[PDB]
Design a binder for this molecule. Structure first.
Ligand SMILES: CN(CC(=O)O)C(=N)N
Ligand SMILES: CN(CC(=O)O)C(=N)N
Ligand SMILES: CN(CC(=O)O)C(=N)N
Ligand SMILES: CN(CC(=O)O)C(=N)N
Ligand SMILES: CN(CC(=O)O)C(=N)N
Ligand SMILES: CN(CC(=O)O)C(=N)N
Ligand SMILES: [Mn+2]
Ligand SMILES: [Mn+2]
Ligand SMILES: [Mn+2]
Ligand SMILES: [Mn+2]
Ligand SMILES: [Mn+2]
Ligand SMILES: [Mn+2]
Ligand SMILES: [Zn+2]
Ligand SMILES: [Zn+2]
Ligand SMILES: [Zn+2]
Ligand SMILES: [Zn+2]
Ligand SMILES: [Zn+2]
Ligand SMILES: [Zn+2]
Lengths: 257, 257, 257, 257, 257, 257
């Protein structure tokens, strides 16, 4: 039986919400350049894949993912000047999250996990949540609860980190098109990665400020912020198990049966 | 090679747009109840599948689809009071279309086909197009051209109509969860249809006005506006060929090499 | 005693709402080209005249009409590229409807009929209604009821259609500046019609898609979508009687005294 | 021939704009309580009547009027708590003005007089103008010129002020439903005034601050801010000529042939 | 102890609101040209200084002031074409006021004085208040009360006006950079005024209409609307005492223990 | 002469912009709880003080600061559920930044430094900049340049961190009301800090997700995310010297004479 809301009938969905402890999950991604070696829908594919596996384990349901996210920023995604990257304005993304929460609440759902896969989305997701909860409070509804997370933050264990990051962990911001995402894609969707096309460059660095209009010269030419040369299917399987396990555990604590 | 932009690298996408006559296609759907016998992501699946086949034929590319559409209306989708149906506000959908066109224009793209799969979306797509073209004009850009269509409108041939609907054509508005959509789904995604669960009610009728708040008693209980009892894979293949050929021809005419 | 809210004192209006069953009616029109032979305020004049007569029969009141409507579309109104046509953005029209409903509800009114006279307004009226009912629900109010209708939909009886169209009906979309509107204008405001200036072209036809920017060649040069050559005062008188009776009956059904 | 754009064909309008110096005029009103003795559409009727007469004199055209205006304020209009008064949000009024200027500019018009008839509208009209002119500049259009006025400000001659206000002029703010508007209505629309119903209270006074929520006790009970007991048709004809002459002269100065 | 909320800890603020009759005051200013002789933050400095003194006297607290206000208008502030003047759009100002009231209500505050220092702000403050009170009404809250005032309106007393203006008071609209503001600044912030730089022109006069785009020729070249040649510290101390006493008394009347 | 734009006349400001290389600086803060020991306007005071000193060194000017910022988040500011914290919606803050940039560009300014003092503001500042630059491009203006920075990012040097934190640096997110801000306040505004009121709790830790509505138990009771027990004036003096030097150097690099 599918864990995807889109693949259920309305009667099946209605029955699941009627159970009374139904957890819904919404992947939030982007269409964004991910270097010479990888396709552009990574930020949708990855959180969706993690949601699917988590949902199988905890008996949750997964909503259709948000395919377009906030403008790529130089220090976390290369920058929005790249071809292919197709970004929403903040108000549009916020409004989309807001509308979806409104509707889930109308259905009777009261438990939502927003799983972000594109670094830049976070604060617009937060605003969408706040505006939706504000509206629910207008109608006397205070029992809608949201958990929001970026899936990579669950990769915390010192031992796990040492495997993908031999010379050190430099941050989730510069994991754009690098070892983390490329490894996951080798594990899940190998036909969409070509590791021989990786342009091996040093981890991108930046001064402690930002400049607009964005200057293309300050992003590595391929659009990646770190090299995925050492990425592997094995690394991807490790990340996947650690994420799925950690997120399933967190969701059970926040949304117990 | 994939016809989906999301499955391309940014370099591959850039090269396709650089050729100068590149046609992009954007499916616009919904998450919406489709009766007891069918799943809720039909309005995304169907135009996406048509886009894919058209794109293969004419050498176009397909953008990630809009998964959430405008509020279901009683006379064309059963109504937004149903569980599962998850709808955007008009401003949100319009803004999403507007943002995407802005970004495609930034890439250098100048040819877009919006393929609607949810009846209620049309006017909000139209407004998104207008607002986007207005903004392009502010930059002296007047060579961006948009074709918008709902894929069912290409099924016009009287002989084909009789083959699909022996008892008579009942209008595309009450083809919600009926013979047309169900037949297409039987041909493309048979596991998401269970024809044994079809409730075989007479076609929905309404007076020449609408009432809000939506009154659930005026929609057939299953949520369908007509019966899919006579739906079949064969009808689906006929529809699919008529739509793909007709749309392929139309796009070749409007966007010639 | 006047049926127009604008022609009442606030005390007279207050007393009518205090009866507890008062029906208010809001004409929603446009300023739009209507060919060489007719003036541009038709879409206001016609629903206002119908509202007046319905209100006289059923004891309703009529609000000041919306004078500007949504952008003219090629297939229904000739297109927004014509001179004279003066159109609102979707958000503006939606917001206007939303504000008016808020205010009527504040007065204690709970029964509203929106009578549309311009084809393109419909979905923005729908959104304005939804947003207003949403806000009322925030205040625990769910007894405000809205009927929305386009007045031409009440010309439906086969006997009536045959009498008005002895050569055949051809649809409401291409009844822009054709026999229907022109006949009504000949009956109500003959000084605003010059039938000698009618250009007698064949009915407009279009492919099953739309193109933006609009291509002006696909609209008949005069701006009409069908010929009003056979329009008459008598046809207009029949349309008027049928519309008024039908709408009066519908409103009594939905809003019994 | 008519001076109202709504009563012209699009060809007649196009020809008038093509002449090169065409002045358009837009009345901006309200639906608002005006005491026990006058109807609620005064703020539309009066500037529309003044526009008509000015247009006849100077060869201008008059657009359909804005029927709904900004929220009535206690110190100028009695307050928005009154029945009947039906007010827009600021953003709605601003957007309406903005949309209309955009469209007039599209037609090729470059001269607009906005004639305000409701005190509270002014700053939202100003913002609408500013936003519209900002957008026009984005397209390299800097030759659209707008004159905005409230018609009563043209009553400046001390001899006229004394005829209306022999005990002294107290300001246009408390001139709500008093001698000025009532006199004009007695001259123009006598059937919409019943002077026997005037409540002859002392002129409304307020402290140098404003309180929200609006306190109904601080407005004179009938909703008028001053008594119309001394209003007369003769005074109305005087006001009408003074306004029409003064506005015609101002428009000739600002928009010379 | 400080009367400024910004200079309190959250515990100190919490305790003051917990008392039950706490009055908060919000200065609303502008960054705007004020002639050759005076700095551009006058409209913040002055209401803030008055707020401080009133708050000391009545035991109120003062919120951080709004530093940026609505677009300067020719007849009241010289016009928004001047350098230095940095103005918000109406929606931005309205939204700021709205957000602050929402948050103060969340804290449990129920008494707010908005003290305006920039003529043009008034209607956007009014709209922000209305939108905030609207949202509070959704939650059943009707005990949040707002007093709004422009501080100069409290200089009313005929005797006071004679001392400040022996040769005649000429209205608050042209008191932009003139005797009133300049005198206050000489009393409070003498280093920010250089009276030798005053350009002594006649009081600004305008016709009874406005023109956009703003024509710079119709504003006195220095940007002032009246001459501050006779401004003095003595006049400033009189104004200050009159304003502080008057406003203190008004706030005690409206927000008593 | 003052480095604050508010303290200049419009002529002085105009002259500085006319020089051709004028750098403007805009502090962007918040009104936010900062523990038991410190006042709530810290996030305005601190970046304003740094801006003042930088401006004095490099010959720049400082605009009036944004006093209200985005909603406090649990992991960086304790959460928006605290009293005193007074937060804007995202759209409001974005619009404020957008409006100010528009206006500065109108003055002829082309170089802006946005100095953020409140962690949560960052993405809304980014969106405001993008929308403003988008509008400038509509007018052919592409030479407006913006540098955005949070002043604490310039305390980077290992030797400086070692001196300030002999026990260990634990990150900027939990430097809310801790050693960093409190030390700066002891150096700049000692009367607004009372170190005896510091609650000396262990550093705040959180799971790798966020929950809404915020659970107040996850924030330390005082609202601080780390203890300021060891804060000192001397630490503050060093932070100030390091920040001012680093930022002055960065601005000269990006905006050379
Ligand atoms: C973690 N990621 C992946 C992405 O969002 O592309 C970052 N770029 N920071
Ligand atoms: C054509 N359709 C299918 C759909 O949009 O669900 C209608 N319901 N009218
Ligand atoms: C019936 N009408 C009337 C109108 O909107 O002008 C159509 N244009 N379709
Ligand atoms: C001048 N007027 C007329 C009106 O707006 O109704 C005032 N109310 N002050
Ligand atoms: C009273 N004021 C002061 C100001 O707003 O600058 C006027 N400009 N009219
Ligand atoms: C450094 N700061 C200070 C603040 O924003 O209050 C962080 N919260 N990170
Ligand atoms: Mn990304
Ligand atoms: Mn549908
Ligand atoms: Mn029409
Ligand atoms: Mn009025
Ligand atoms: Mn001012
Ligand atoms: Mn902060
Ligand atoms: Zn990614
Ligand atoms: Zn469907
Ligand atoms: Zn029409
Ligand atoms: Zn009036
Ligand atoms: Zn001032
Ligand atoms: Zn802080």
């Amino acid at each position: 039986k599918s864990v995807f809301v889109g693949e259920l009938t309305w009667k099946e969905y209605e029955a699941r919400v009627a159970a009374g402890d139904c957890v819904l999950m919404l992947p939030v991604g982007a269409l964004e350049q991910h270097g010479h070696h990888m396709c552009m829908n990574v930020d949708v594919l990855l959180p969706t894949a993690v949601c699917k596996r988590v949902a199988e384990r905890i008996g949750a349901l997964v909503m259709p993912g948000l395919q377009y996210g906030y403008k790529s920023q130089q220090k976390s995604g290369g920058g929005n000047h790249f071809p292919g990257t197709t970004s929403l304005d903040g108000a549009t993304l916020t409004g989309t999250v807001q509308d979806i929460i409104r509707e889930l609440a109308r259905h009777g759902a009261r438990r939502l996990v927003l799983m972000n896969g594109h670094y830049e989305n976070s604060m617009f997701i937060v605003e969408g949540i706040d505006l939706a909860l504000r509206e629910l409070r207008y109608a006397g509804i205070q029992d809608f609860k949201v958990v929001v997370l970026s899936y990579w933050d669950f990769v915390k264990d010192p031992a796990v980190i040492q495997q993908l990051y031999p010379e050190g962990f430099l941050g989730w911001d510069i994991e754009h098109g690098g070892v983390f995402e490329t490894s996951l894609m080798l594990a899940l969707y190998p036909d969409l990665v070509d590791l021989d096309r990786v342009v091996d460059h040093p981890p991108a660095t930046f001064p402690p400020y930002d400049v607009f209009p964005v200057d293309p010269a300050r992003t590595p030419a391929p659009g990646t912020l770190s090299s995925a040369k050492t990425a592997s299917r094995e690394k991807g399987e490790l990340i996947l198990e650690v994420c799925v396990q950690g997120i399933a555990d967190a969701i059970r604590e926040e949304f117990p049966p």
